[PDB]
Symmetry: C2
Subunit: 491 residues, 2 copies
């Protein structure tokens, strides 16, 4: 029963090519990410790249006591193994946990390995920059980043209002991090409330976690009093409550079994240029595959303490590549599943938040026309997808004999089951996502500002009345294995 | 505190031009509908027509003791009076009731005015066709119809599964009505189960109710054991449970305060052609404003009894015009509201399931661009609407200074806040609704079968960056009341 990051590493070590360690010295600045680019970053990272093992770097230059984990979630198959289901059903299996969550519980400090070591920022010798190897993903980044920081925080006026969300933070100084907070999201609203009263907002950043927690926390959750409800998904996935502990230096909870916890406060009335120390003009690589722009005005966590386990692992990601595809893509798929299946039961066979869109921009919907009235519902399923997940950009529709996880087979449906002046429907001027660099006025006369897009539905389903002409060549069913057993061993 | 149909009539009589009686003899065959066409049918009925009073016909040729009420829900203002809220808030107000329903209650036969008179069908003199006037809406109809039948039914194996649905029924014999039942609806899964076992399904048809029952019954409701859950909406709207009573001739509940109850059984293994007796080839007028085709294979209710209050009112509708716009459009608006507000909170100011689409085909969305990021979200709101209600056909988007209940003002926005080669987005080949006669392959080379349409989004919102040029001419705020008091007393 997996309850923390090390229980997960143990499971991976029982399967081939899921976990890999190296003792060869690596520089956290640029080099480590450059290495994993080849081994397992995947997704929208520039070629060459591939799906591979999660990888542990034991020998980090300048950090003789540290080790860095990347790629834990950077494969769909791997995520399936870590949660005990089939990779094609991963979105549905987690969607079931979302529906029957198990609440987290509070434990005492004696039960929290994340507090086996406490480094108070009090200490004159404290220096976040030398305590933690925060990797730099590319040389043009704004600085070192932590990329899997699970932030816990509460409303400053109503303490029963909580939030759990993944963030990335740039290291800005001996005890400072900058942190981008999405407008409108709960923790930013918390921070705006505290700042309007001139007060800091206490927060914990929890890194190195059971992958069920990271995966579960990307889904929308209900809000109950003191609920930290995102944690309920992982509670359901393991059938064991996620354990919280009180912070040592701030009045906010932290993840009891996390590897590293950064406790601090968002400062009132303070802001920094994200790239103030490099003037690179960039932040770090974004899920579409491009380096984003540096944010000119960011809030700052003032660090009051770092607590960690003995031999703490620092967990982050590279790419963000396939690791982002998994964390973002399963929620994208679940919400599309839920919307289509409630409106058109039995129609959708599956949906894939394609890695080529980082799990957000590109939806592949596999439908089955069962009867004459299903003609015209394939467009309806596309409208449902675009309405339910507004950061989507394009939809590709295929039938149930097309493998939506096989990009060759998607392009095959786009070649023999599509006519350009019939099957392609453009929907201009719909808000999409600012990190798509083609969503700009300069790219298109129908785009009125950044993050607005034309959204395109590629209908590659066979028209109902023509289906008799579109049967794929029927090869006979045979068990191939007796013909070459040793060859099918390689699985 | 309204509890039944008569209470609602008494409220209407307190307001001018909300209720109107006539004692001039009227033929229930075509004439009655012909008259109300002029007075209050409204909606998609051919013109002349208008919004008007609900109308009671006291003198029915062939039925010297009967009276026929029509138009009860045929006005949004009238529907808001009957629920005690603002017309522009109707969908939101019934949505509140949808969330906190009160359960109906069972009461003994002595508490059910619907059982003041009992007409068992095994009496030799029983004739459904002469006991009650069933209007025929037009001369090309399949036959006489009851158009506001609230049907109650339970699952035949598991009695804890209940459904409450609104139906129309054509009178086909002295003891039989034909009744369409939508596939997938819980009422017909009960009927298919009973039929698969060669058994009848007992049923009540409850007509002449508190408008809060009819209106609430058009919303989706959850299922709880022995729930009759649709009725909880009406119960929360009145904050008093709607009372039921055991049927005298079938094992199934009826509405205790209803005006007329038809008790019977859906018969297994027997169908009927709707235009049996006429060969008209039509059923009756449909919400888009055209007569529908006759249904060639319909199930039959075998009537075992009819019960009714003393001086029972027969409540039905005409058009179906504005009455259908109310019953169908409030749920349409409610579901669009819930979707857009969950997805883009604070952005939608109101939505109107426009009567020109019978409450189904045409959605007007009123949005407010509060900030630059809202540019691009008005199209998102239209997509949300098309996805949550697949029978929509077109969406018109407007800003918060456009009155979406005023069709002149809609067309105004379509005229000064719209460029044809920019603001109009077509989405071809989406399944819509077979009763739109333009959704056929003959109308469009992009339509592959009936009930498939091109769906069009008309964006009549001001582009964010240009809003400083589109302020409507600002007339000073003044209370006009004092300048013409007696004029405003109308």
């Amino acid at each position: 029963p997996i309850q923390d990051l090390r229980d997960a590493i143990a499971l991976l070590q029982q399967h081939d090519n899921q976990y890999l360690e190296t003792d060869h010295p690596v520089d956290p600045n640029a080099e480590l990410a450059g290495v994993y680019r080849h081994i397992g970053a995947g997704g929208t990272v520039k070629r060459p790249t591939r799906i591979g093992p999660a990888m542990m770097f034991n020998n980090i230059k300048g950090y003789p006591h540290s080790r860095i984990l990347v790629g834990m979630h950077a494969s769909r198959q791997r995520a399936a193994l870590l949660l005990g289901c089939e990779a094609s059903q991963l979105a549905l299996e987690v969607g079931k946990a979302v529906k029957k969550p198990v609440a987290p519980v509070v434990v005492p400090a004696s039960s929290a390995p994340c507090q086996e070591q406490i480094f108070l920022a009090d200490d004159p010798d404290f220096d976040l920059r030398t305590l933690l190897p925060a990797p730099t993903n590319t040389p043009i980044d704004a600085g070192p980043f932590f990329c899997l920081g699970l932030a816990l925080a509460s409303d400053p006026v109503d303490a029963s209002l909580t939030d759990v969300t993944i963030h990335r933070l740039c290291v800005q100084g001996r005890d400072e991090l900058s942190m981008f907070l999405a407008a409108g999201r709960h923790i930013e609203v918390f921070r705006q409330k505290a700042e309007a009263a001139g007060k800091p907002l206490p927060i914990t950043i929890n890194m190195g976690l059971d992958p069920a927690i990271y995966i579960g926390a990307c889904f929308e959750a209900p809000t109950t009093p003191f609920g930290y409800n995102e944690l309920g998904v992982a509670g359901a996935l393991r059938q064991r409550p996620v354990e919280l502990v009180q912070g040592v230096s701030v009045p906010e909870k932290a993840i009891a079994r996390a590897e590293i916890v950064i406790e601090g406060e968002l400062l009132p009335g303070v802001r920094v240029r994200e790239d103030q120390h490099t003037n690179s003009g960039h932040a770090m690589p974004e899920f579409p595959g491009y380096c984003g722009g540096a944010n000119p005005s960011l809030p700052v966590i003032k660090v009051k303490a770092v607590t960690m386990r003995n031999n703490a692992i620092l967990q982050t990601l590279v790419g963000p590549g396939e690791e982002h595809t998994t964390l973002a893509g399963l929620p994208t798929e679940a919400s599309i599943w839920n919307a289509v299946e409630a409106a058109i039961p039995g129609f959708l066979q599956n949906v894939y938040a394609h890695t080529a869109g980082g799990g957000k921009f590109l939806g592949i919907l596999q439908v089955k026309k069962r009867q004459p009235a299903d003609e015209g519902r394939q467009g309806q399923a596309a409208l449902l997808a675009l309405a339910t997940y507004s950061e989507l950009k394009n939809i590709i529709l295929v039938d149930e004999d097309v493998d939506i996880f096989d990009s060759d087979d998607i392009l095959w449906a786009m070649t023999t089951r599509m006519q350009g002046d019939v099957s392609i429907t453009t929907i201009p001027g719909i808000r999409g996502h600012q990190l798509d660099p083609s969503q700009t006025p300069e790219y298109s006369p129908s785009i009125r500002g950044n993050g607005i897009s034309c959204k395109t539905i590629f209908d590659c389903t066979v028209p109902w009345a023509l289906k008799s002409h579109f049967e794929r060549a029927p090869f006979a069913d045979v068990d191939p294995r007796p013909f070459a057993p040793e060859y099918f061993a390689r699985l």
